């Protein structure tokens, strides 16, 4: 029952988990720098890494189990190396995590034509459910840190680091 | 005390780890495969992988802690998806730690020619060791597999995945 | 193995060992004053103040070991009694862990001119590493510091006392 | 009760225990090569190296206790250091064995002709049985790789290796 | 109620502290070289040491706690590093603990004079009596050196070093 | 990475330290003699022999890991087997280290010559610390031994026995 | 099996091991003397008394064991009261055990002629190799008086009581 419409899209989905693990890696060593130095910030997004690999591994693992092929490209790069400040990254990831949600939810649309539940009940059970709180988590970072005045006062990102990400 | 030539060096050798990663990564989900079924050599190959991201992560943290910059390059897809056999993914891996073991000499040669001791130790300490004891064990693994009479003998591979990898 | 030139550059390193020790005592009482109160730069530096001392009785074992003659200076008071805030203090922390550091990298440069590949082992292992974590934490607590007006700004001392040196 | 040529005899058999400690050891080294790789021999002989060594030590106090003078010899090295097979080496361990026995025999056979009777017992209580069972071991194992088709069959000598020495 | 030559004179006391922790360093070192060797006596001034920088320390916080101002000097390096002989370091420390307590006898003197309780009951408690107590303890150790033979006996200084300091 | 006359040298200190071992062993046997019948330096010299072996058995596996060839030459006996006295084995056993010290830095020497870093980092891990604190110690008990007045003063060697080595 | 030369001849070495106890039971109480007080001589010698009423007893439930017919004699008094020095009860006791060895060795050689194999593995594995232990630990004891100057030297025998002995 497994289309390879289907097979290629997964691939392709795999690629951009990968993706977005790689750019909270950057994210995470961003915060460790010494002219940075937001340790909490940094632990943070090493987590939200972690995290997008379980999400990419969850699908190599659909893969081999309807039995299509995995077929692997070249992760690239995050668009920058300087993310600027802790509310940049928050708002990168946020976007970040939209643009994935939207490739997920076209995804899902896929399977629903070609009659596959089980890819779709798959996407709803680990993915939708966990994007639609990250971007709500990320959602609320954004806001406090501009309610605080980040990232032009100074106090700002500082203490939203040691307390809500600490 | 730390060179231009050094951090760029560094940010290469960075993903290098990354790209040994993504290969390890690839054969544990090769191993997967229903027409595979290798689940020893799936789950040694998945360490393997995690190891190959602490390695860059390690590096990661040389770079922040000396005040380099790091510089994220793409991460290259591994040259095959089909392994062939568990001999075949052994030997190449056995490869890629030799020349990932080349890469990790030179930049320590650039270090020595440079003055840099702490980079010396750091590589010394972290890297050449473990290096040296993962060309090893997969050596050991080759030759065992080759005696064994792999890929062809139907009885080897299945036997080395229940017995050493198990 | 042991030179005379080498003897003593190593004497001379313990008497800056015993140095920094000295000023990171002068600095844990500068906080403890009645009119500055930032128990926990003055808990920081206390505990500083004792690594080096650690560090300078490490350096005297070696010259026990390596049976050469300790031979000890006066050591000098530090150039203030007037740090003047918790953000000048760290300022001259860094800049005296730096000069330490070349201190230090001069000393390895001398052993490996005279073929001593302990005393350089020595100081890879126990002192040049520390050294860059060392640096890279100052550096840390300096730029936090600065981005959050400090010393200008009243609350930014006191807040970094109380999150992240407590 | 200690004759001269009981002394001399007794030095002779402490310099032999000494050479099959270095056989078994060379045999332990043998086997964890990157082109043998059978981790269970090598750990079977390397506690082998070991008893040999207890054995010549006993000796060793049984000359101090008795009032001879210990007066020990080079310990010549091993005949090779290709030990070709685990099949191999265990004939090789099977007839070191058998003729430290004949020398353990003919040193009983002295001890008796000078009515020697704690030095009989000495060899009888910790040597004679020790030395019969070590024989029927070795002998165990040389007589299962030979039926299993070792060396040449690839499979024998990694399930000997697998099974019994595990 | 804090006099500024009270002020002065506590600055005093605790750089002569600091001056005998240096002695007692020094001190512990002599004694851990390769023609010394006598590791309790090291290990004994070692532990003087650390407790003369405690009561550098105590004077310390009590110059904060009273509004005064601590102003530090030099530690001048000790007299010797040969220290000669077991009997001869014993001699120098009560010789030097003889002549802290002076300079602390003079020191509550000036309280006396300037009416400050405070301070004449500070020396009382911490000082007075533990410097009554090293002294004695010393003269006893000095003593026992002496009738033992110390230091041309060759027995006294390791047997006391082994019973008494052990 | 592993150049042949690396491998040579290696094999020669191999030989070494299996030397020292047997005359440790040798000195060990030589203090339980009725004769002699110092049990503690009997058993200092064996633990001294066993961590001999240690360092032989670290090289051999070294050696394979490094795809050398371990080739074991005979172990010849040690010079002696009349010790004379505790002071003079101990003199001996200093006299050894030393010798086998100014082997491992021209071992060192020849790494450093054909850019061995692996090698190099080997032995300043595992033998150049562990020598120079052997000789040290050796170089303690030598002169404790002479203070005390050995090996004619009848109580030094006992009283050494029962108190440094007991 | 059990000739009657055999019973008469076990009954004198039950005579025998009894005249020993008693031996040491008179040196256990002249080191309790209060012009010897030695008191862990007499603490060993005491010891030893009880382990040859041990060595009596088994003799005599063999007799029974084997049919024979106990016949006691009486136990004569030991040669002296006055045993002068610790040293000199020390070589009276090596005598004494000297003189059982060659009574038991006679006993062993008249078991054989008579092919009495139960007793002689008998005497092989009670008797003839803890006397041999006990010959080589008295052995020991008097070279370490001897070399300590007993009992001329003041403090030999005592600090041989308070170390080895206690
Ligand atoms: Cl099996
Ligand atoms: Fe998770
Ligand atoms: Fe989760
Ligand atoms: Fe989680
Ligand atoms: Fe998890
Ligand atoms: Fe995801
Ligand atoms: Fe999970
Ligand atoms: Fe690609
Ligand atoms: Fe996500
Ligand atoms: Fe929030
Ligand atoms: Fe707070
Ligand atoms: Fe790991
Ligand atoms: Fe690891
Ligand atoms: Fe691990
Ligand atoms: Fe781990
Ligand atoms: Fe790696
Ligand atoms: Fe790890
Ligand atoms: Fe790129
Ligand atoms: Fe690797
Ligand atoms: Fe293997
Ligand atoms: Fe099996
Ligand atoms: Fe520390
Ligand atoms: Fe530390
Ligand atoms: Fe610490
Ligand atoms: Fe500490
Ligand atoms: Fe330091
Ligand atoms: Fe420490
Ligand atoms: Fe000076
Ligand atoms: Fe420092
Ligand atoms: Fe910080
Ligand atoms: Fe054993
Ligand atoms: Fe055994
Ligand atoms: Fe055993
Ligand atoms: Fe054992
Ligand atoms: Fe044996
Ligand atoms: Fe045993
Ligand atoms: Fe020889
Ligand atoms: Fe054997
Ligand atoms: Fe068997
Ligand atoms: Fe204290
Ligand atoms: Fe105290
Ligand atoms: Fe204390
Ligand atoms: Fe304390
Ligand atoms: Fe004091
Ligand atoms: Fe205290
Ligand atoms: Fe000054
Ligand atoms: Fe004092
Ligand atoms: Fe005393
Ligand atoms: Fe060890
Ligand atoms: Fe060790
Ligand atoms: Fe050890
Ligand atoms: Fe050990
Ligand atoms: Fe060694
Ligand atoms: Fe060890
Ligand atoms: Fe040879
Ligand atoms: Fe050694
Ligand atoms: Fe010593
Ligand atoms: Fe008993
Ligand atoms: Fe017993
Ligand atoms: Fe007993
Ligand atoms: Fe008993
Ligand atoms: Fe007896
Ligand atoms: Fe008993
Ligand atoms: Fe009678
Ligand atoms: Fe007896
Ligand atoms: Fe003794
Ligand atoms: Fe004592
Ligand atoms: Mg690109
Ligand atoms: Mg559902
Ligand atoms: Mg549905
Ligand atoms: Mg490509
Ligand atoms: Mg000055
Ligand atoms: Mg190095
Ligand atoms: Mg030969
Ligand atoms: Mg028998
Ligand atoms: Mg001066
Ligand atoms: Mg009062
Ligand atoms: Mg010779
Ligand atoms: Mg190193
Ligand atoms: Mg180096
Ligand atoms: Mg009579």
Chains 1, 2, 3, 4, 5, 6, 7 share one sequence.
């Not at 693990?21 to 937001?38: C, E, N």
């Not at 896929?110 to 890819?119: F, I, Q, V």
């Not at 990250?134 to 006062?153: T, Y």
């Amino acid at each position: 029952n497994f289309h390879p419409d289907s097979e290629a899209a997964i691939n392709r989905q795999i690629n951009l988990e990968l993706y977005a693990s790689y750019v909270y890696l950057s994210m995470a060593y961003y915060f460790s720098r010494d002219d940075v130095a937001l340790n909490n910030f940094s632990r943070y997004f090493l987590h939200q890494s972690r995290e997008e690999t379980e999400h990419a591994e969850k699908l190599m693992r659909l893969q081999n189990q309807r039995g299509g092929r995995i077929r692997l490209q070249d992760i690239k790069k995050p668009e920058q190396d300087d993310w600027e400040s802790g509310l940049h990254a928050m708002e990168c990831a946020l976007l970040l995590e939209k643009n994935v949600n939207q490739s997920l939810l076209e995804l899902h649309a896929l399977a629903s034509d070609k009659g596959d539940p089980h890819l779709c009940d798959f996407l709803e059970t680990y993915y939708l459910n966990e994007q639609v709180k990250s971007i709500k988590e990320l959602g609320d970072h954004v806001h406090n840190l501009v309610k605080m005045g980040a990232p032009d006062a100074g106090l700002a990102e500082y203490l939203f680091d040691t307390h809500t990400l600490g």
